[PDB]
Amino acid sequence: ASLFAFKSFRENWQRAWVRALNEQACIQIAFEEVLPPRASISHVTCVDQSEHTMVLRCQLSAEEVRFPVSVTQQSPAAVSMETYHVTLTLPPTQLEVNLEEIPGEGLLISWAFTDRPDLSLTVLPKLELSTIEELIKDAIVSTQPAMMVN
User: Fold this and answer.
1) Residues in the chain whose C lies over 2.5 Å from the next residue's N (breaks after)
2) Coiled-coil ranges per the record?
């Protein structure tokens, strides 16, 4: 929580979440660019505290987060691609952040939703949208991002 106040950490946090999201995607959906109008982490609690690790739980929420998503279709000797505008809203839901000290590398951070988040996102092209929504929802609900700090 003390690290969520540094701008540099928030950037990598989002950039790490986008990296994990694209991995699980492997039609093919991809999150292009990395910001949110309003976000908040609350009720930070320490469930476990080992000698070299630490497990935390908290409530995460964001409103009107906007990011592009690209749909890529591979075909005989060809690649097509169409990008969309996505607007997501995450109500307060619980995730578990896991910290682990790695010798010679830094501090490994990992997180994942503990329960299915009640997402409410919309998709609109940039000049079926229903299916693109479920692929994004399915990825966000399942991914367990990770990142290395120092």
Assistant:
1) 26, 34, 127
2) none
